[PDB]
């Protein structure tokens, strides 16, 4: 539940913020091969999402594991086709569209809405 600006944004921001804390951790020093992304928001979809990386391909990120290897590392570098990954981006960790109470769905929209302490829908 770390909302960024947009789908196109978070990928560039995640690589950027990481380097912002420690420059050179890309293929220069660490083998950061991973593509991790997750986003939880209510029905409106609020086009944003979270992106994460780790430095050993095959480890675990708290997101949707898509790419692993030098291609995911180039994602850390910033050399990636967002037009490719976004247009075939998987709704697996993308957000959920509720109903008007007509259908029963998972716990609250994100987690600040209680998390297993409420049943919030989107009636609109």
UniProtKB/TrEMBL annotation:
It comes from the Bacteria. It comes from Escherichia coli. InterPro entries: MsyB. Residues 112-124 have a biased composition (Basic and acidic residues). This is Acidic protein MsyB. Residues 96-124 are annotated as: Disordered.
């Amino acid at each position: 539940m770390t909302m960024y600006a947009t789908l196109e944004e978070a990928i560039d921001a995640a690589r950027e913020e990481f380097l912002a804390d420690n420059p050179g951790i890309d293929a220069e020093d660490a083998n950061v091969q991973q593509f991790n992304a997750q986003k939880y928001v209510l029905q409106d979809g609020d086009i944003m999402w979270q992106v994460e990386f780790f430095a050993d391909e095959g480890e675990e990120g708290e997101c949707l594991p898509m790419l692993s290897g030098e291609a995911a590392q180039s994602v850390f570098d910033g050399d990636y086709d967002e037009i490719e990954i976004r247009q075939e981006w998987q709704e697996e960790n993308t957000l959920h569209e509720w109903d008007e109470g007509e259908f029963q769905l998972e716990p609250p929209l994100d987690t600040e809405e209680g998390r297993a302490a409420a049943d919030e829908w989107d009636e609109r």
